[PDB]
Coordinates of C-alpha atoms and ligand atoms in Angstrom, one line a residue:
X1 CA 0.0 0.0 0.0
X2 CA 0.2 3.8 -0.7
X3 CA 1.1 4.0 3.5
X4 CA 4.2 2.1 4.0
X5 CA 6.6 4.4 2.6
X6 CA 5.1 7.7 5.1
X7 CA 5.2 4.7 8.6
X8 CA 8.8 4.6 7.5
X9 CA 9.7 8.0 7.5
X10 CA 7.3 8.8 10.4
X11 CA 10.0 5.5 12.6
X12 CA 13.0 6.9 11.1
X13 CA 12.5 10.4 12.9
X14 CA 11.4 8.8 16.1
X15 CA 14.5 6.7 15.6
X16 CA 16.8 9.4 15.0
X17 CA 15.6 11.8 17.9
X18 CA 16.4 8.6 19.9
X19 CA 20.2 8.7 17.9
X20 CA 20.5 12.9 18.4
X21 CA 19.5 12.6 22.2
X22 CA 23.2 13.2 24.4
X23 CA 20.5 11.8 27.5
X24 CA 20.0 8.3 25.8
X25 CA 22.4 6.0 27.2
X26 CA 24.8 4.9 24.6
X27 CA 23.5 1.3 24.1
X28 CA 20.3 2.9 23.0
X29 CA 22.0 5.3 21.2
X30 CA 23.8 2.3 19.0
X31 CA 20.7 0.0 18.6
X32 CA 19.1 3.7 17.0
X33 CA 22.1 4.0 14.7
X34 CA 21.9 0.7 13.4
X35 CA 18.6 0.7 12.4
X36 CA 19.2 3.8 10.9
X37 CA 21.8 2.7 8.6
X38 CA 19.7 -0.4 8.0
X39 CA 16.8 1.5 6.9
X40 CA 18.5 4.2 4.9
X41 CA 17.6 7.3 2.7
X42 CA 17.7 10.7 3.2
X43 CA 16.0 10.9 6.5
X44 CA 18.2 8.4 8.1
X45 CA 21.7 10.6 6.6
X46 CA 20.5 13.5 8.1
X47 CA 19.7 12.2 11.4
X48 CA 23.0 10.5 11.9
X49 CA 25.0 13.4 10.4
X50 CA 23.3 15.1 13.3
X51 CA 24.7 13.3 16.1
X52 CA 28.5 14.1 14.8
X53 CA 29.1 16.7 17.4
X54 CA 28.5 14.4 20.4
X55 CA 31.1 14.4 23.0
X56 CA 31.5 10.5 22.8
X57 CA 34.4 9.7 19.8
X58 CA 33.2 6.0 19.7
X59 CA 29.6 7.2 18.7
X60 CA 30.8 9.8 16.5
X61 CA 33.1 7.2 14.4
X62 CA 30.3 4.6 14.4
X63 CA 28.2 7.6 12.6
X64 CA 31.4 7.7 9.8
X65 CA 31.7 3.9 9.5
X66 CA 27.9 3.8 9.0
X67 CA 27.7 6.0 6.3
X68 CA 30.5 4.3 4.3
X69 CA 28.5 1.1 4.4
X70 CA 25.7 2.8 3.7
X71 CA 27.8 3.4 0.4
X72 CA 24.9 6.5 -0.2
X73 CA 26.9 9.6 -2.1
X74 CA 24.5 11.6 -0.1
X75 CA 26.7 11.7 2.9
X76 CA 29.6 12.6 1.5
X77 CA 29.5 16.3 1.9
X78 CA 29.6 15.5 6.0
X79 CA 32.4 12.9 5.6
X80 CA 34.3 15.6 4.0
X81 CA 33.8 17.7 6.8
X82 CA 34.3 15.5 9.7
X83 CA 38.0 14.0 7.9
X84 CA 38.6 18.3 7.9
X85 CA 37.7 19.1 11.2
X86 CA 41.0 19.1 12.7
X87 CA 39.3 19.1 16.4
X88 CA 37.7 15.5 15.6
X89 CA 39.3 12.8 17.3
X90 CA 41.7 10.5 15.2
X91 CA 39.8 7.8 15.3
X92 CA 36.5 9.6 14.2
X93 CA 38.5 11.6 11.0
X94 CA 40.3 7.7 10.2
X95 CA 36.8 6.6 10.0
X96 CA 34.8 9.3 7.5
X97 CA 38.2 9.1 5.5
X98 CA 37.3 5.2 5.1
X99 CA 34.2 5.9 4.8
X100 CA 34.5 7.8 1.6
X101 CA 35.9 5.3 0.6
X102 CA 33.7 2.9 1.0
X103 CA 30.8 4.6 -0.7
X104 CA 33.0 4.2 -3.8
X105 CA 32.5 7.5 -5.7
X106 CA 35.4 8.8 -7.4
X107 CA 34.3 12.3 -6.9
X108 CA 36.5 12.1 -3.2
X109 CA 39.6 11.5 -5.5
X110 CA 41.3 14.8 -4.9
X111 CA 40.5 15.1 -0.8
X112 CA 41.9 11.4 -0.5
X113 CA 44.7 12.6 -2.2
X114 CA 44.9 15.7 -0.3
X115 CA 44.4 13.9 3.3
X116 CA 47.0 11.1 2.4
X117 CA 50.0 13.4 3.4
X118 CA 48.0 14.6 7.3
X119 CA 50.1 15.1 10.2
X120 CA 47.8 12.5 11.9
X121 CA 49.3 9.5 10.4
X122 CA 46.0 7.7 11.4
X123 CA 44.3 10.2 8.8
X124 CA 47.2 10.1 6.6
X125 CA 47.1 6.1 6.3
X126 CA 43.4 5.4 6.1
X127 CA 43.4 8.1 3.4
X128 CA 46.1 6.1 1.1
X129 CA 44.2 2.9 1.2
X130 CA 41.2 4.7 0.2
X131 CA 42.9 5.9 -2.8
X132 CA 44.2 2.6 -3.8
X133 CA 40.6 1.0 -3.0
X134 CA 39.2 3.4 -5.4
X135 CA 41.8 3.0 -7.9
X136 CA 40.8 -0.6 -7.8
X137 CA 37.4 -0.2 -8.0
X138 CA 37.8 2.0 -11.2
X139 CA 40.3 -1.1 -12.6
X140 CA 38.1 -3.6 -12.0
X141 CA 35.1 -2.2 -13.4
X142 CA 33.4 -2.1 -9.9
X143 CA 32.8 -4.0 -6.2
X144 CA 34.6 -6.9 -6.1
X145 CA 32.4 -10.4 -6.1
X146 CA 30.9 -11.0 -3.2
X147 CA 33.0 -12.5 -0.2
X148 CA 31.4 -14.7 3.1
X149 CA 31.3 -10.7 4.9
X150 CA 28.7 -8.5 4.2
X151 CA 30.9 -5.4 5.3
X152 CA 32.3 -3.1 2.8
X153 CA 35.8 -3.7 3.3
X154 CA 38.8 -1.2 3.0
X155 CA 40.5 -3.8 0.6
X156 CA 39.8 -6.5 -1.4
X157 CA 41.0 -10.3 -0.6
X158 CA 44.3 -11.2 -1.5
X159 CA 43.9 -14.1 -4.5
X160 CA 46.2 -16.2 -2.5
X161 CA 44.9 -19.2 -0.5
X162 CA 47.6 -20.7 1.2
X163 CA 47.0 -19.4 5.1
X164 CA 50.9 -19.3 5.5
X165 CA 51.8 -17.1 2.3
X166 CA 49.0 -14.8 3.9
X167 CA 50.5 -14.6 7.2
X168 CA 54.1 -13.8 5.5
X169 CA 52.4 -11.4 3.6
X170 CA 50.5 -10.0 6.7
X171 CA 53.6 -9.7 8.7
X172 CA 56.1 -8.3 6.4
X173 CA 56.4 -4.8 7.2
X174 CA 58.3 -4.3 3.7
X175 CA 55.1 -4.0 1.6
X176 CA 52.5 -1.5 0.9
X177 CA 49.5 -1.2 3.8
X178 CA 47.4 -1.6 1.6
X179 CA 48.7 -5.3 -0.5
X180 CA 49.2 -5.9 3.5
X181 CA 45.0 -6.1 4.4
X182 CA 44.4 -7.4 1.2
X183 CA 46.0 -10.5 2.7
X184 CA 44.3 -9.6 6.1
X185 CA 41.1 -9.7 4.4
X186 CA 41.9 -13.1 2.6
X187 CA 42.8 -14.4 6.3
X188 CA 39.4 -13.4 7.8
X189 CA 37.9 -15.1 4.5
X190 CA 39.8 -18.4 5.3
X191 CA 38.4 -18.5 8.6
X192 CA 39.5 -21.4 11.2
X193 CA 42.4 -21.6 14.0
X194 CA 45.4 -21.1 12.1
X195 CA 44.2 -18.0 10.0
X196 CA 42.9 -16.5 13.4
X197 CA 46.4 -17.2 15.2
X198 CA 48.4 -15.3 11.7
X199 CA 45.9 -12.5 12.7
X200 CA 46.1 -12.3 16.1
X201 CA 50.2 -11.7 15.1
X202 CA 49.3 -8.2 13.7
X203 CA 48.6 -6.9 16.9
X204 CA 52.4 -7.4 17.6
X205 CA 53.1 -5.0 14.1
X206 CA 54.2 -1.4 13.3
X207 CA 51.4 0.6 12.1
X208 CA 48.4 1.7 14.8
X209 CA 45.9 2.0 11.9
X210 CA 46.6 -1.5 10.9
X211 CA 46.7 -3.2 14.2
X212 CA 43.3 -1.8 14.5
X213 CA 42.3 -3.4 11.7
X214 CA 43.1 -6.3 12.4
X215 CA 41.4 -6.0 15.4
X216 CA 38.2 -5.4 13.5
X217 CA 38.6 -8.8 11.1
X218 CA 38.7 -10.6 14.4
X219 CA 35.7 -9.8 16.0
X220 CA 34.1 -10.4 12.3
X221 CA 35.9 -13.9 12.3
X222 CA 34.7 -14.2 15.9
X223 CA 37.1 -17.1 16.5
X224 CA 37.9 -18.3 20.2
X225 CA 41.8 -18.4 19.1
X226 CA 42.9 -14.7 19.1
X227 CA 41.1 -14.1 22.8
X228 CA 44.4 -14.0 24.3
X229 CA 46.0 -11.6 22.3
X230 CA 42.8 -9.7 21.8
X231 CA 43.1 -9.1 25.6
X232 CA 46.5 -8.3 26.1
X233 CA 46.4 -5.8 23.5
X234 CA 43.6 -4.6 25.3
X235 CA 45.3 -4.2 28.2
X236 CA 48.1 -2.0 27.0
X237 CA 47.9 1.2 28.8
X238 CA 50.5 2.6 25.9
X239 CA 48.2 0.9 23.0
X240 CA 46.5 3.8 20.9
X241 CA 42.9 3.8 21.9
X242 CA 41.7 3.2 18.8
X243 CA 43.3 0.0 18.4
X244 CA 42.6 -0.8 22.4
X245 CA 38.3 0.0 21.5
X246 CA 38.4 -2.2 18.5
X247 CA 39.5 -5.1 20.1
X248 CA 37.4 -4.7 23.3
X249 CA 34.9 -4.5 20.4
X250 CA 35.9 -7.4 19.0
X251 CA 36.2 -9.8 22.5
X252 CA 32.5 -8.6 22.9
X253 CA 31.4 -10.2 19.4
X254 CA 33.9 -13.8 20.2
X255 CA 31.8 -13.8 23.9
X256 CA 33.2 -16.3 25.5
X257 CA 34.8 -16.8 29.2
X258 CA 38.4 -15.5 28.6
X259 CA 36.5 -12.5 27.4
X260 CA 34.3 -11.5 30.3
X261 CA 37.3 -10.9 32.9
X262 CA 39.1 -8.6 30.1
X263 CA 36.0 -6.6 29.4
X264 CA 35.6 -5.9 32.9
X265 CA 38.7 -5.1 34.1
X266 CA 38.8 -2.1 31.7
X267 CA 35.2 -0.7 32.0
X268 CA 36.7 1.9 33.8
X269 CA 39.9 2.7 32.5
X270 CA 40.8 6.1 32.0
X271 CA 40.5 6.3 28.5
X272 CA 36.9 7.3 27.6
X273 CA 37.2 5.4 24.0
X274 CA 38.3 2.3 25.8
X275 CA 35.5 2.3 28.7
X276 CA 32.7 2.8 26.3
X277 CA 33.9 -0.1 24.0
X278 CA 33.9 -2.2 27.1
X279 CA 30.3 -1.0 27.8
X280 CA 29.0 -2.1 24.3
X281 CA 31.0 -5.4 24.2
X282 CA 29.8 -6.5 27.7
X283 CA 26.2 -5.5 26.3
X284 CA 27.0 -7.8 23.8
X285 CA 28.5 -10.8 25.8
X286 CA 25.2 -10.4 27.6
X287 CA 23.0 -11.1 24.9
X288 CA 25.6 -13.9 23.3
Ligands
LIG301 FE1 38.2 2.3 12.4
LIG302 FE1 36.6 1.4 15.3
LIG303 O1 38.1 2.8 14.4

């Protein structure tokens, strides 16, 4: 019927003044953004573009990494702005840099280009893979085939199947970043034990960006394997934030008993990032 397309917009504002609401507690707060990026359109863009001035960084750069799934060239003129706001956080200007990305529309080409030489070399990094994940797209004539992972990935898989030639290829901090998670994607792929423990070795490497990222593919592989490096990384009071949040994020998705104690013991570290990934991952070991 003639109806269902006015219901939709009339739950996507209810569900955005939910999002836009700094009194919501932030689980709420999440399960509003979600839905939001689930539903899509307009409405939903504007509503989370809203919420980018919030005082939490993890909401703010789940807003960015939203709107890259999203892959809507709608939100790109925010993206733009939050990668140029110089008083964003890292981790939130990292994320709307991948996110343009991720939408795929070569129209970013000359900001990536621009943001690849930041002084944040967070900014700086995520901005050269975006380049080279556009450059691929426009080689390849568009997205690559569908993989096992519904996420829009920064790269695509490395052709290689052999787990160990990925985890040399992982580890070797001679090669580009980004010919380095195309392998990291092609581990996740693999799945099982031994690509989870080649992972899991990336939270011992150089860059901060990529550690995170690796970080990321593990809660998405959600193998019982990497808990113990998950946690200690975790629990590395000199670890950047960003890569401490994502894999707090990622123990929350694995949810299992080595998990809980980690969780736990940093839901009230000093780091604001770090406590609130904590929150949402023992939220999430709850309803595992
Ligand atoms: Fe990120
Ligand atoms: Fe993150
Ligand atoms: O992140």
């Amino acid at each position: 019927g003639p109806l269902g397309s006015m219901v939709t917009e009339q739950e996507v504002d209810a569900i955005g003044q939910t999002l836009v609401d700094p009194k919501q507690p932030l689980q709420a707060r999440f399960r509003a953004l979600f839905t939001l990026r689930g539903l899509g359109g307009p409405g939903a863009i504007a509503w989370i573009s809203q919420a980018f001035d919030d005082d939490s960084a993890l909401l703010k750069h789940e807003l960015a990494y939203c709107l890259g799934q999203m892959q809507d060239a709608r939100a790109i003129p925010m993206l733009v702005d939050v990668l140029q706001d110089t008083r964003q956080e890292p981790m939130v200007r990292h994320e709307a840099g991948e996110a343009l990305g991720a939408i795929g529309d070569p129209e970013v080409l000359e900001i990536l280009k621009q943001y690849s030489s930041d002084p944040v070399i967070e900014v700086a990094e995520t901005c050269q893979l975006a380049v080279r994940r556009l450059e691929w797209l426009q080689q390849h004539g568009g997205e690559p085939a569908a993989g096992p992972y519904l996420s829009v990935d920064p790269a695509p898989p490395a052709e290689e199947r052999d787990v160990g030639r990925l985890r040399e290829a992982l580890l070797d901090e001679s090669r580009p970043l980004f010919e380095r998670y195309r392998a990291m994607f092609a581990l996740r792929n693999a799945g099982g034990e031994e690509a989870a423990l080649a992972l899991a070795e990336g939270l011992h490497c150089g860059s901060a960006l990529f550690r995170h990222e690796v970080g990321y593919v593990l809660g998405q592989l959600q193998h019982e394997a990497a808990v113990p490096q998950l946690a200690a990384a975790l629990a590395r009071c000199t670890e950047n934030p960003m890569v401490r949040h994502e894999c707090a994020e990622a123990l929350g998705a694995i949810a299992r008993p080595a998990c809980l104690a980690a969780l736990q013991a940093h839901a009230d570290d000093p780091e604001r990032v770090v406590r609130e990934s904590c929150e949402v991952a023992l939220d999430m070991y709850e309803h595992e």
